[PDB]
Design a protein around this ligand. Structure first.
Ligand code: GLA
Ligand code: GLA
Ligand code: NA
Lengths: 346, 339
């Protein structure tokens, strides 16, 4: 079943229910996921209206770009030239600049394929918007199927050589309550290295570091509390996790990460080289989600993209996009029940 | 009564019906007027869904900007510096460039005041968008009241010195049918001067001309057919009218123009200095409106704004907008039915 209704400010809420009775919802305001429920329980963080996103926090569940993450001094080099982008976090350009794509109303069309339903959102970033060369015709397809797979497929074409590396900003919290920390969740992640941050401004330090056998090593499943309790310098610097993890083996075919709570698991697949993990280190901010005050560590993202900092660490990749060349990316989040035995206490 | 329905592509259609039973409807796709009817008759041109506008012609009824009209070579000077805007008509920047504000989905809020209902649309134009310095936070409020007054009020604020001169692009056609020419309508317009066009590229020619006692003098009501059959080189150049007329007296209190057909009339009020009048000189194009094939001269606009061409004729005005200043504009289309 497919259902649509006004969500506020002119945005719509598109709600899907698959054959297994699992429901998921999206809005065209920032081509974003609003909710995902199983048995009446929220699997992710989200608000009840458009206004809330704009008044409380506009990133949760959104599509962010054109470049996800921080770009030191807002400086990028395009086909030989240096370009300065909108600077919204001090001298840094964070998540494409102020009033970016996550704040726009995208147009959309729904395609019903039976066992699969696709929601294709479109938007044009005009040439020069927030300093980005263009224009860039973008499209984000969110699809949900009978197999409980939520897939995100990105496509883009630019009239001019530019940069492009968007991502999906969903926050998971298997407790279904923002006021409950995700430290009770188990995490498995196929990554042996990470990118440390320079300082509080959160730009990259410049080096790549091996995390095997440290508190950030999740190759073998472990409780999140091990990280949160860590006194490692990087952890203390941001009061939790807020870093890019470099995947060891690439390819859409491999389960790169798995987040588990009791009988529920979320598996992560992607064709991108890294996953930026941010554990909502908001401290006492207490943003209200469904009338619940959010706690420090009350959520966790899995932002799959080319790691930020490629401007300083060329080894991370190249986010350039040549005029006329078609960009594509695919990330998938799949829901499973009883994939493993996870019975713990905190 | 107010009614909201899905207009396609995620866009909304907001319809307002006042005490008199007159119906006017808007869409957030381009903060635009879609229809206006009385007794089942359309007074303006419009389509039946969002896709139509995107496939056929995105200008009808839209809020166009940041700058309305043609800018020679896409060039503007801001604080003594040259800036090149997106060029979408040859080397000119027309109606703000490609994929401009008329094609974006604006957020909106409806305010029901009883005798009056307002629909406030908002959109943020990022700094650099199509070459325009910004951010420019813009709002366009469309309001309809029990006196049959459709009012448009614009407001904007920019973080940087830039340029700003939007307009409303509605096309009227009191015949209620696009296949019929507006040549039978009478027009009155309180303007004695006009701005001639250079040539077919439609950039301004450079001068300001007196229209007194010419085929373009409408100070005294007259049938459009007159102008339409004229031999003035300007009329011939464009095959109708496609020009800025300079208003004689400035101020919102004065009826600047009047469009009439039989018992029905439309009055125009604005706080702007000029009115650009375009008579849908599309030739054989034949765009379809409500299944009706549009004819040459099958519509007419009243684009109120600062005259295009101020980049070459300073006397026309100045469209600059200084950082931090609040821009405001108001235009009103008043419907009257004779008894
Ligand atoms: O709230 C936005 C959030 O987005 C990312 O995860 C960043 O790495 C965090 O530092 C933070 O800016
Ligand atoms: O179709 C849009 C229309 O906009 C204005 O009326 C112009 O002066 C015309 O030349 C035409 O471009
Ligand atoms: Na809607």
């Amino acid at each position: 079943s497919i259902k649509i209704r006004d969500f506020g400010l002119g945005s719509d809420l598109i709600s899907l229910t698959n054959k297994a009775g699992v429901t998921i919802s999206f809005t065209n305001l920032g081509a974003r996921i609003v909710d995902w429920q199983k048995d009446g329980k929220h699997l992710i963080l989200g608000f009840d209206s458009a206004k809330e996103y704009l008044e409380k926090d506009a990133y949760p569940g959104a599509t962010v770009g054109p470049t996800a993450g921080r770009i030191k001094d807002g400086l990028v080099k395009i086909s030989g030239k240096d370009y300065i982008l909108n600077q919204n976090e001090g001298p840094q350009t964070l998540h494409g600049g102020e009033e970016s794509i996550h704040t726009k109303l995208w147009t959309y069309e729904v395609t019903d394929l039976g066992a699969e339903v696709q929601v294709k959102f479109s938007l044009v970033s005009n040439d020069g918007t927030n300093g980005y060369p263009g224009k860039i015709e973008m499209s984000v397809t969110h699809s949900f199927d009978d197999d409980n797979k939520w897939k995100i497929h990105y496509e883009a074409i630019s009239d001019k050589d530019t940069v492009f590396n968007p991502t999906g900003h969903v926050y998971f919290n298997l407790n279904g309550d923002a006021s409950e920390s995700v430290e009770n969740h188990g995490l498995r992640l196929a990554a042996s290295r990470f990118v440390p941050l320079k300082d509080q401004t959160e730009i990259v330090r410049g080096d790549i570091v091996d995390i095997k056998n440290t508190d950030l090593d999740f190759r073998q499943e472990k409780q999140l509390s091990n990280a949160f309790n860590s006194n490692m310098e990087q952890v203390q610097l941001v009061k939790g996790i807020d870093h890019p993890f470099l995947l060891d083996q690439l390819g859409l075919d491999k389960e790169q990460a798995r987040l588990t709570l009791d009988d529920t698991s979320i598996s992560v697949f992607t064709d991108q080289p890294s996953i930026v993990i941010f554990t909502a280190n908001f401290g006492d901010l207490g943003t209200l989600y469904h009338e619940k005050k959010q706690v420090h560590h009350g959520g966790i993202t899995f932002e799959c993209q080319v790691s930020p900092g490629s401007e300083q660490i060329p080894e991370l990749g190249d986010i350039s996009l040549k005029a006329g060349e078609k960009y594509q990316a695919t990330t998938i989040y799949s829901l499973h029940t009883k994939l493993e035995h996870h019975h713990h206490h905190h």
